[PDB]
């Protein structure tokens, strides 16, 4: 089991090395969209002799075939990646650090000064390898600026005059890697990136609202075939389309008189 | 909800933080607005820990967990990952925008 | 004996140095689930080798069978080498 874990840790180092030599994105090969073929010949439902309710079941098995063939193409990537890393796993370094356990000799005891430096090694890996230097304002400088505002007489608003000094360093907080500042490191946060998504969702949803605005200004009878029951009507020929809504759509199209 | 239950209570209003997550500055100021009850909970737990090994272990864990510089930011840690997790939703929207440009 | 097994859990590679997401996403999804199972296995082995309050009841599974061999009808300290050496005296003398 120690050798299986050293084999797995050497394998996950081989995966990280030959994926950083190829410089590939992290999520690219785990995304099965990237193994999907968009230039497939896309089977036409008008040449497959479908009846009225048969077209959405045709669409589902063209999709789920093309999705299964992208998943099975992702599996063929990773099964070929595995043998590429297992070949380099066999020629690897195997110089890993050991798990910090408290030192226990054969007939001796365990000192608490060694149980505690082991616990220091567990809580020194709880810090992240690259972190924002998010500054807390100490009370040694939050009072030296509070009473400087209270010597001028802003002791009633002495709460807010400190928080702006806290936030002005918090907002341009720099990142530190190993205690040293890596400089020229711009990060896009998770509240910025969720604002890029929320505006991009609103500018595509208003194109859907503008799409259906034109189709219901010209042809307002389209609002009587519900959107889920639409391709349940289709067929391969136009005469095969289900007449559930045909005679209703023709009479709503003629107007309100 | 569970990540923010420890700060905003039980009626956390998870809709507000799903839509607009809190910035790295608001994660800081939610750390600092519970730190006095966090350093006093750890001192009340280290006093009633079963042994002086566990008493050091609940203060050393809180000495790391109460520092706001130790909050792991995935965008700071893995910058190429959080841009690619952005382009999973920007590519899902772009496929809905190509469908409306074709229409 | 638990110390000799604890000494080989001391020489276990630090798997928590590969918990980052640059090892999560570069790795095969089945070789990562094996890695997370091999890390859950070490905590199974380590939490039972440090269960030293269970050694005092394992010693009581050795005691009663030993103590019945000492309740011999011949002698407490009898063994085969002595009782074979005293068959040589018994057999290779006259009747």
């Amino acid at each position: 089991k120690k050798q299986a874990t050293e084999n797995l840790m050497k394998l996950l180092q081989a995966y990280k090395d030959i994926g950083d030599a190829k410089s590939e994105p992290l999520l690219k090969n785990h995304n099965p969209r990237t193994f999907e073929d968009r230039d497939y010949p896309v089977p036409d439902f008008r040449t497959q002799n479908l009846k009225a309710g048969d077209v959405p079941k045709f669409f589902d098995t063209v999709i789920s075939t093309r999705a299964s063939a992208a998943i099975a193409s992702k599996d063929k990537f990773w099964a070929g990646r595995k043998t590429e890393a297992e070949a380099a796993s066999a020629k690897a370094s195997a110089a890993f650090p050991r798990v910090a356990v408290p030192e226990w000799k054969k007939g001796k005891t365990v000192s608490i000064e060694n149980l505690n430096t082991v616990t220091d090694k567990y809580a020194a890996a709880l810090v992240p390898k690259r972190k924002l230097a998010l500054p807390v304002l100490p009370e040694g400088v939050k009072k030296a600026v509070e009473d400087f505002a209270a010597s001028v007489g802003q002791a009633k608003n002495a709460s807010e005059v400190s928080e702006l000094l806290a936030k002005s360093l918090a907002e341009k907080a720099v990142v530190t890697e190993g205690g040293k500042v890596v400089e020229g490191f711009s990060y896009v946060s998770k509240a910025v990136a969720a604002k890029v998504i929320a505006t991009r969702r609103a500018e595509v949803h208003e194109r859907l609202l503008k799409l259906w605005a034109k189709r219901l200004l010209v042809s307002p009878e389209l609002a009587i075939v519900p959107l889920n029951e639409f391709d349940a009507q289709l067929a391969s020929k136009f005469e095969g389309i289900s007449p559930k809504y045909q005679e209703l759509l023709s009479a709503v199209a003629q107007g309100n008189k | 909800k569970e990540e923010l239950k420890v700060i905003y209570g039980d009626n956390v209003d998870v809709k507000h933080f799903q839509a607009s997550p809190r910035t790295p500055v608001q994660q800081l100021f939610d750390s600092l607005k519970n730190a006095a009850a966090n350093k006093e909970r750890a001192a009340k737990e280290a006093a009633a820990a079963a042994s002086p090994y566990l008493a050091y272990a609940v203060t050393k864990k809180q000495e790391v967990q109460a520092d706001p510089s130790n909050i792991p930011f995935d965008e700071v840690l893995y910058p190429q990952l959080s841009e690619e997790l952005l382009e999973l939703e920007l590519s899902d929207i772009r496929e809905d925008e190509i469908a409306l440009e074709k229409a | 004996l638990s110390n000799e097994r604890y000494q080989l859990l001391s020489q276990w590679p630090d798997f928590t140095t590969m918990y980052g997401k640059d090892f999560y996403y570069r790795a095969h999804p089945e070789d990562l689930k094996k890695f997370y199972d091999a890390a859950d296995e070490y905590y199974k082995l380590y939490e039972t080798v440090t269960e030293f309050d269970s050694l005092s009841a394992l010693a009581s599974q050795v005691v009663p069978n030993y103590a019945a061999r000492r309740r011999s009808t011949v002698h407490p300290a009898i063994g085969s080498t002595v009782a074979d050496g005293a068959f040589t005296n018994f057999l290779l003398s006259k009747q």
Side-chain angles (χ1 to χ4, degrees):
Chain A
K1 296 172 174 194
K2 181 198 141 176
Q3 204 53 48
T5 315
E6 280 172 351
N7 285 351
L8 282 160
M9 284 186 52
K10 276 192 304 174
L11 195 49
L12 305 198
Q13 185 64 225
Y15 282 133
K16 203 203 181 178
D17 278 342
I18 78 184
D20 288 9
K22 299 185 176 307
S23 298
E24 58 194 12
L26 284 177
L27 290 202
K28 175 197 171 177
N29 312 110
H30 296 267
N31 196 2
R33 298 267 188 87
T34 62
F35 300 99
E36 204 184 347
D37 207 12
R38 323 284 287 132
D39 289 331
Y40 210 61
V42 55
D44 198 64
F45 75 107
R46 316 188 192 98
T47 74
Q48 316 286 150
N49 301 318
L50 286 315
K51 293 301 165 294
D54 283 18
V55 188
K57 204 253 181 182
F58 171 81
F59 283 157
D60 296 333
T61 73
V62 170
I63 284 169
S64 67
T65 287
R66 203 186 27 171
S68 305
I71 285 166
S73 176
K74 176 189 171 297
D75 298 357
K76 195 193 146 301
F77 176 76
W78 278 118
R81 173 68 95 196
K82 186 166 186 170
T83 80
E84 189 181 340
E86 280 188 320
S89 173
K91 296 180 287 292
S93 176
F96 296 130
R98 293 306 188 236
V99 185
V101 294
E103 187 211 36
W104 180 28
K105 300 300 201 164
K106 185 64 146 299
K108 306 302 171 187
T109 46
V110 176
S111 52
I112 204 174
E113 300 95 11
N114 189 257
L115 284 161
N116 286 340
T117 71
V118 158
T119 305
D120 294 351
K121 296 188 193 171
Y122 299 151
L126 263 187
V127 309
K129 314 275 201 60
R130 181 188 298 144
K131 52 192 158 307
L132 265 180
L134 277 186
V136 191
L137 212 61
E139 268 68 36
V141 82
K142 93 163 283 298
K143 212 65 195 69
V145 302
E146 182 170 12
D147 276 6
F148 188 82
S151 69
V152 160
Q154 300 188 27
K156 186 145 54 61
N157 60 89
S159 298
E160 71 93 18
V161 298
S162 60
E163 303 156 1
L164 271 301
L165 185 54
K167 288 195 189 66
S168 164
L169 279 169
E171 280 176 343
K172 293 179 179 179
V174 83
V175 313
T176 61
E177 178 161 47
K180 61 176 294 290
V181 170
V182 46
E183 188 65 29
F185 188 88
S186 286
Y187 75 104
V188 44
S189 76
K190 203 173 71 67
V192 162
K195 205 68 167 52
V196 184
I197 291 166
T199 64
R200 199 77 175 86
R201 272 170 189 161
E203 84 162 317
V204 168
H205 158 78
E206 81 165 0
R207 290 192 61 162
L208 177 89
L209 273 189
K210 279 169 182 187
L211 197 89
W212 286 109
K214 313 162 188 173
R215 269 74 168 169
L216 295 163
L217 279 176
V218 168
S219 169
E221 71 270 2
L222 253 53
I224 79 178
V225 198
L227 291 180
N228 46 7
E229 296 296 335
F230 162 75
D231 49 356
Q233 314 305 125
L234 298 180
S236 280
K237 300 305 173 186
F238 186 79
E239 54 264 24
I241 295 187
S242 175
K244 187 185 198 313
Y245 294 112
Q246 294 286 145
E247 204 53 46
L248 197 61
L249 279 172
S250 296
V252 178
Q254 290 169 19
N256 43 3
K257 295 199 295 182
Chain B
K1 184 187 203 66
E2 289 294 280
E3 181 218 337
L4 305 168
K5 205 173 61 68
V6 313
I7 300 155
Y8 295 88
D10 272 18
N11 312 276
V12 63
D13 188 53
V14 61
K15 174 58 193 59
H16 171 231
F17 299 99
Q18 180 170 30
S20 63
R22 37 179 206 170
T23 173
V25 184
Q26 188 46 234
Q27 302 193 32
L28 163 66
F29 277 74
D30 292 325
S31 174
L32 303 185
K33 76 188 212 185
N34 207 3
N38 275 0
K39 210 172 63 174
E40 197 265 317
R41 180 164 44 87
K44 195 177 188 294
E45 201 190 350
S51 58
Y53 176 67
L54 288 177
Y56 180 90
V58 305
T59 64
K60 191 63 180 190
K61 186 178 52 175
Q62 195 265 351
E63 185 175 325
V64 173
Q65 279 182 336
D67 195 27
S69 165
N70 296 140
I71 299 181
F73 292 122
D74 286 330
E75 54 263 21
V76 179
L77 277 163
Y78 316 102
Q80 277 72 236
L81 178 69
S82 287
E83 69 179 19
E84 284 167 47
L85 276 166
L86 173 70
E87 286 111 22
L88 287 193
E89 277 82 7
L90 290 198
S91 293
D92 204 4
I93 289 162
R94 182 56 191 164
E95 290 295 323
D96 275 358
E97 205 194 36
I98 293 171
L100 300 179
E101 287 177 353
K102 284 175 182 171
Chain C
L1 280 185
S2 286
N3 184 80
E4 301 181 22
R5 319 284 201 263
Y6 179 97
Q7 284 309 294
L8 54 92
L9 300 185
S10 293
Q11 293 302 127
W12 215 272
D14 209 332
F15 39 81
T16 75
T17 52
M18 309 207 151
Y19 281 179
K21 290 169 179 175
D22 46 351
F23 290 99
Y24 189 104
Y25 285 123
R26 288 265 179 263
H28 190 119
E30 295 294 326
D31 298 347
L32 191 81
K33 294 193 187 67
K34 283 169 188 164
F35 175 75
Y36 281 3
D37 280 355
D40 267 11
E41 173 202 62
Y42 176 80
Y43 300 136
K44 193 195 71 59
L45 306 178
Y46 188 77
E47 290 189 321
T48 181
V49 82
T50 63
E51 187 68 35
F52 303 120
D53 282 4
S54 291
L55 300 182
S56 165
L58 294 183
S60 294
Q61 305 175 8
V62 191
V63 165
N65 275 336
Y66 165 83
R69 289 180 43 88
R70 291 307 107 183
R71 274 194 312 274
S72 184
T73 61
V74 178
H75 197 93
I78 202 55
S80 289
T81 313
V82 169
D84 290 357
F87 201 64
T88 290
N89 175 243
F90 173 77
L91 202 67
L92 312 193
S93 308
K94 56 191 71 61
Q95 77 264 20

